[PDB]
From Swiss-Prot:
The gene is Rnf213. The lineage of its organism: Eukaryota, Metazoa, Chordata, Craniata, Vertebrata. Disruption phenotype: No visible phenotype. Males and female are fertile and produce normal-sized litters. Mice do not spontaneously develop Moyamoya disease, a chronic occlusive cerebrovascular disease. Mice are however more susceptible to Rift Valley fever virus infection. Mice show elevated expression of MMP9. The chain holds residues 3868 to 4730 of 5148 of the full protein. A zinc finger (RING-type) spans 80-119. Monomer. Interacts with UBE2L3/UBCH7; UBE2L3/UBCH7 is the most efficient ubiquitin-conjugating enzyme E2 for the ubiquitin ligase activity. Interacts with UBE2N/UBC13; promoting 'Lys-63'-linked ubiquitination of target proteins. Atypical E3 ubiquitin ligase that can catalyze ubiquitination of both proteins and lipids, and which is involved in various processes, such as lipid metabolism, angiogenesis and cell-autonomous immunity. Acts as a key immune sensor by catalyzing ubiquitination of the lipid A moiety of bacterial lipopolysaccharide (LPS) via its RZ-type zinc-finger: restricts the proliferation of cytosolic bacteria, such as Salmonella, by generating the bacterial ubiquitin coat through the ubiquitination of LPS. Belongs to the AAA ATPase family. This is E3 ubiquitin-protein ligase RNF213. Composed of an N-terminal stalk, a dynein-like core comprised of two catalytically active and four inactive ATPase domains, and a C-terminal E3 module. The ATPase regions do not generate movement but rather act like an intricate molecular 'switch'. The RING-type zinc finger domain is required for the ubiquitin-protein ligase activity. Zn(2+) 1 binds at C80, C83, C100, C103.
Length: 791
């Protein structure tokens, strides 16, 4: 009792009183009074999980607020009567009412020369605006209202929802009531952001989820009706005639996050979870005719949907490691048998759509297309027509469409000029192309890679182009002066004659080696075609690896160990915390491009990369390729993306190192002979990486549009049930329901710690959340102070 009282008063002091002393010191004798008034209203019973003290604290905070407003600006700072919010560019009438300037110019200009509220005329014009008295009064009132809101929401989050038992019905109904505001005059039925106050009100109904995430920390069996009341209120006043997909999607997301919390913080193993969910799946009657006239989707139905999504997520996680390797622990096997029997019995193909999307979001499209074979024992995950509508010539995603619509022209001309044997169309696509000679040469080299070396990859198209199709290609390569550079057309011939020793990269995964091969060819093309001072060191890791022994490679440890001082990538260590001044994404991107240039170098001569890499004696290609694998896994963890989008990020960053021929990048040696040249490299390259990562949130959907609507991937139905297209070309799925659209059965991201570290780094966390920033920087090392008293 006494500590709940002391802690509530401490929340008030911390959020209101110290903010008043720091920012607006005209209200400190008011808030020091209301400390004592909170103490006296909590000394009877400081049990904020009940109704009476919670209403008492809320009333004390409300009259603290309005006495502060009357202390500011002469008996009643009020919101604008027209826009129902804070007055922007304030204008005060002689009837002591403050309005917005835009509201009083959009209202008073017809023949209604009066006041909207107190019906009092204004003679001449609303000419003076007050930028000193009323503007500062409204701003300081906004600050004090924000302090009181921070106190109230922190008090509700900490005291009302403290322990494992839920609070009473009256306090929860009070909270759900104060999500909404009353009607004043017609617009009505507004919303507000969990405040005891009424003046800060948005004009369009937004739907927060703070009380869902606070109520769902209890068991769902005892908070059904509260969420159903909140949903019924939202459906009867706010979104009564709308597209109610996103509201349902917010509720499904909150419910599945609550189940993630109660299985993570709960103490039960995988075996009990698999038994409980397997019992759930083999008794799930569909009942979709029960709640869908159009609009009724209760919270029991949404909870069954969220629980089905979690069963399918466990199925996706099991299938992503079943086909990684060996046997699958005999409980995961039985659970996948239950998921298969579930998808067979229940005739909803949206579960299989979500399962395909989730396997592709974890692994990629090629891994999922490997399940669509003629007897692969994971073929049940597809819906019914996707197996029959595929051909025997599934093609890979062209990830060089990052360049886009000038690469598209050259790859189409190259494809037709290897299809027939007429290589004038490549010259027509290049001469009608902007983005000058470095970019055009890179487009031509990547097109030659894509078409000709992807013909050598397949067992159908290999040993085919040697029959009089490579002769016109070789004649164009010898003839064309857009690649008249003897280090470039030697590379072009090595792509076409299949003599480039990157293409024999020799890995055992056969999905990853395609990714690493495409990235290494992209790196080698950028380092040949790009003319930039920030490509000269990596160039000597790739094309002249003997110059670059006794040289400090980027993202290496420093106290000093020149060369490549990293051990085996198959270690059990901490996750290689970032450099002297770098965020972990920029760190892993710099390390990944260094390793890709080193792989391109070690494919030419492995001896110079043996004398660069310090410990072993055996081989550099598999070593560097395992490092590239680990870097891609860490980059997938950090960026909250799918696998394919992370690879698009890498290819986009590689593309951006070519168009950036502005030179502000001097003052380091091209050999990187010192620490200082390496660190200046780090700085300029971090500048390019941050320019490209500030801007990728809008480039990623355009790149996914170019790669999804490529007319060699687009007709594939796996692509049409993953990328940007609903699965409603399939007829055998439920009709236009509110609950069975493509948006509800889409995949989302599991929220990791590295993703939150990435958000802290995006949102300037050194200066905004510095304890959290320092915590996330050293988190994997701080897991192990737990073992200090044992050692
Ligand atoms: Zn207004
Ligand atoms: Zn008035």
């Amino acid at each position: 009792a006494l500590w709940n009282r002391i802690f509530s008063i401490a929340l008030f002091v911390e959020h209101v009183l110290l903010g008043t002393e720091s920012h607006i010191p005209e209200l400190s004798p008011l808030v020091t009074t209301y400390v004592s008034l909170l103490d006296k209203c909590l000394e009877e019973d400081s049990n904020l999980k009940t109704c009476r003290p919670f209403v008492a604290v809320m009333t004390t905070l409300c009259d603290c607020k309005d006495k502060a407003s009357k202390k500011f600006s002469r008996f009643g700072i009020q919101p604008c009567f027209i826009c129902h919010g804070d007055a922007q560019d304030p204008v005060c009438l002689p009837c002591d009412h403050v309005y917005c300037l835009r509201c009083i110019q959009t209202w008073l200009i017809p023949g209604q020369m009066m006041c909207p509220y107190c019906l009092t005329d204004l003679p001449d014009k609303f000419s003076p605006t007050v930028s000193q008295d009323h503007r500062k009064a409204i701003e300081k009132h906004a600050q004090f209202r924000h302090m009181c809101n921070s106190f109230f929401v922190d008090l509700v989050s900490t005291m009302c929802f403290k322990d494992n038992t839920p609070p009473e019905k009256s306090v929860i109904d009070t909270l759900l009531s104060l999500l909404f505001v009353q009607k004043e005059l017609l617009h009505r039925e507004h919303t507000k952001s969990l405040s005891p106050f009424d003046d800060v009100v948005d004009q369009t109904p937004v739907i927060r989820s703070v009380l869902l995430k606070l109520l769902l920390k209890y068991s769902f069996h005892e908070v059904k009706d509260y969420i159903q009341n909140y949903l019924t209120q939202l459906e009867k006043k706010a979104f009564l005639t709308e597209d109610k997909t996103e509201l349902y999607l917010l509720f499904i997301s909150c419910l599945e996050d609550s189940v993630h919390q109660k299985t993570s913080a709960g103490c039960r193993n995988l075996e009990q979870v698999l038994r409980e969910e397997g019992h759930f799946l083999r008794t799930y009657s569909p009942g979709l005719q029960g709640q869908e006239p159009v609009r009724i989707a209760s919270v029991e139905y949404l909870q069954e949907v969220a629980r089905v999504r979690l069963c399918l997520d466990l199925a996706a996680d099991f299938l992503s490691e079943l086909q990684e390797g060996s046997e699958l622990a005999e409980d995961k096997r039985r659970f996948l048998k239950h998921v298969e029997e579930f998808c067979t019995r229940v005739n909803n193909d949206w579960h299989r759509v979500y399962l395909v999307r989730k396997l592709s979001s974890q692994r990629g499209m090629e891994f999922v297309q490997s399940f669509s074979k003629q007897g692969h024992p994971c073929q049940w995950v597809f819906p019914r027509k996707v197996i029959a509508q595929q051909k025997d010539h599934v093609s890979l995603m062209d990830r060089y469409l990052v360049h886009g619509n000038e690469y598209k022209a050259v790859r189409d001309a190259t494809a037709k000029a290897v299809l027939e044997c007429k290589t004038l169309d490549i010259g027509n696509a290049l001469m009608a192309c902007r983005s000058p000679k470095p970019q055009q040469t890179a487009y031509l080299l990547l097109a030659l890679y894509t078409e000709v070396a992807a013909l050598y990859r397949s067992p159908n198209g290999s040993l085919h182009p040697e029959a009089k199709q490579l002769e016109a290609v070789n004649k164009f390569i010898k003839e064309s002066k857009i690649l008249s550079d003897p280090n470039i057309r030697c590379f072009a011939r090595s792509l076409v004659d299949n003599t480039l020793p990157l293409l024999k990269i020799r890995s055992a995964n056969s999905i990853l080696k395609g990714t690493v091969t495409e990235m290494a060819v992209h790196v080698a093309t950028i380092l040949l075609c790009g003319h930039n001072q920030i490509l000269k060191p990596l160039r000597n890791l790739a094309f002249y690896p003997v110059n670059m022994a006794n040289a400090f490679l980027p993202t290496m440890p420093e106290d000093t160990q020149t060369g490549h001082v990293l051990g085996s990538p198959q270690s059990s260590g901490v996750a290689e915390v970032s450099d002297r001044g770098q965020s972990p994404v920029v760190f892993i991107l710099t390390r990944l491009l260094t390793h890709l240039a080193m792989l391109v170098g070690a494919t030419h001569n492995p001896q110079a990369l043996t004398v660069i890499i310090k410990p072993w004696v055996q081989d550099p290609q598999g070593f560097l390729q395992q490092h590239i694998q680990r870097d891609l896994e860490q980059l997938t963890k950090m960026l909250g993306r799918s696998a394919d989008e992370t690879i698009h990020v890498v290819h986009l960053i590689l593309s951006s190192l070519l168009r950036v021929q502005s030179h502000g990048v001097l003052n380091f040696n091209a050999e990187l002979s010192t620490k200082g040249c390496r660190n200046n490299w780090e700085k300029h390259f971090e500048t390019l990486l941050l320019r490209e990562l500030k801007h990728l949130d809008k480039n990623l959907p355009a790149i996914n549009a170019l790669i999804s609507q490529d007319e060699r991937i687009s007709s594939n139905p796996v692509t049409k049930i993953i990328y940007g297209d609903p699965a409603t070309f399939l007829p055998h799925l439920p009709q236009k329901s509110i609950i069975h659209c493509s948006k509800i059965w889409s995949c989302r991201r599991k929220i990791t710690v590295e993703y939150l570290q990435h958000i802290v780094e995006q949102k300037n966390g050194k200066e905004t959340v510095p304890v959290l920033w320092h915590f996330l920087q050293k988190e994997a090392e701080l897991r192990l102070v737990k073992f200090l008293p044992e050692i």
